[PDB]
Design a binder for these strands. Structure first.
Ligand SMILES: FC(F)(F)c1nc(S)c2nc[nH]c2n1
Length: 266
DNA sequence: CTCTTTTTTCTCG
DNA sequence: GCGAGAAACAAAGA
């Protein structure tokens, strides 16, 4: 998932597990608990969930005053709320058992991660990863964005995916954003002009906020409607909305890349 | 049978 | 520092 899907999960979890005391925690794949499963089980068992936050694509469980559980779903992670007698499914790895239900984490590819960190270490955790601003008008400053693009020789799509210019874009929404902003994915950022950068900035905010409103593109968060609004991603060979052309797919920095050549010339 | 396809971080030259 | 390619992993499709 990307930021809109993680935000949709965050909102549903916030509605349902805040206030719940953790009765037990079980793992069939403890290796995804990067800080140590036995330590996490000891610290969090018997604690009450106080809230669920998000930063970029990271989910942040607020569990007691002094701990946060930082969860990343990577490529295929999925959460579901199940009854206590729910049968185990093949790719379930972790479960947080409450008195009247359980939160189960599944991940076919086993990429997703859990990290237990103390409350006063959350901001340093994200500083160390150099995560960029949240994609909102209030947080995403166009002036700094423009300066960073000017000083770099990177291609725009890889640079946006690095999470350092702005947080939360993945392969789907970066393709949608560059189509909407009429920018080639291999455009070198120091060749972007101010009016293009302005449109890119606004387009990032607008696409991600619309995606959040529509519940993401498609367990929790599986009821999104943003997939019906995608213009280029996964649409290889189909006609662009700025009509005439067919959507092409190339490889850029090892990622499948969907774009409309006429609309996105360098 | 092989090869390719679908977030983050590391290795290598 | 850089970028390309690979690594972590599983399943499905060509
Ligand atoms: F593909 C890419 F290599 F450009 C890339 N994509 C994503 S989603 C990403 N997240 C952190 N770093 C990242 N690099």
């Amino acid at each position: 998932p990307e930021l809109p899907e993680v935000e949709t999960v965050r909102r549903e979890l916030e509605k349902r597990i805040v206030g719940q005391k953790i009765i037990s925690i079980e793992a069939t794949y403890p290796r995804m608990v990067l800080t140590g499963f036995e330590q996490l089980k000891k610290e969090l068992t018997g604690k009450t969930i106080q809230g669920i936050s998000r930063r970029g694509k990271y989910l942040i469980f607020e569990i007691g005053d002094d701990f946060r559980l930082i969860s990343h779903l990577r490529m295929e992670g999925k959460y579901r709320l199940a009854t206590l007698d729910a049968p185990r499914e093949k790719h379930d790895h972790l479960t947080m058992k409450f008195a009247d239900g359980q939160l189960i984490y599944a991940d076919v590819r086993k990429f997703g991660t859990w990290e237990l960190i103390s409350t006063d270490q959350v901001l340093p955790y994200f500083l160390k990863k150099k995560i960029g601003p949240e994609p909102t008008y209030e947080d995403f400053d166009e002036k700094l964005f423009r300066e960073k693009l000017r000083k770099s020789t990177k291609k725009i799509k890889p640079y946006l995916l690095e999470q350092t210019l702005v947080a939360g874009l993945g392969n789907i929404y970066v393709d949608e954003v560059l189509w909407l902003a009429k920018i080639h994915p291999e455009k070198e950022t120091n060749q972007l002009i101010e009016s293009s950068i302005h449109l890119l900035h606004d387009s990032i905010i607008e696409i991600l906020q619309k995606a959040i409103k529509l519940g993401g593109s498609s367990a929790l968060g599986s009821t999104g409607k943003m997939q019906n609004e995608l213009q280029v991603y996964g649409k290889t060979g189909e006609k662009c909305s700025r009509c005439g052309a067919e959507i092409q797919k190339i490889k850029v920095a090892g990622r499948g890349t969907h774009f409309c050549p006429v609309c996105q010339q360098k």
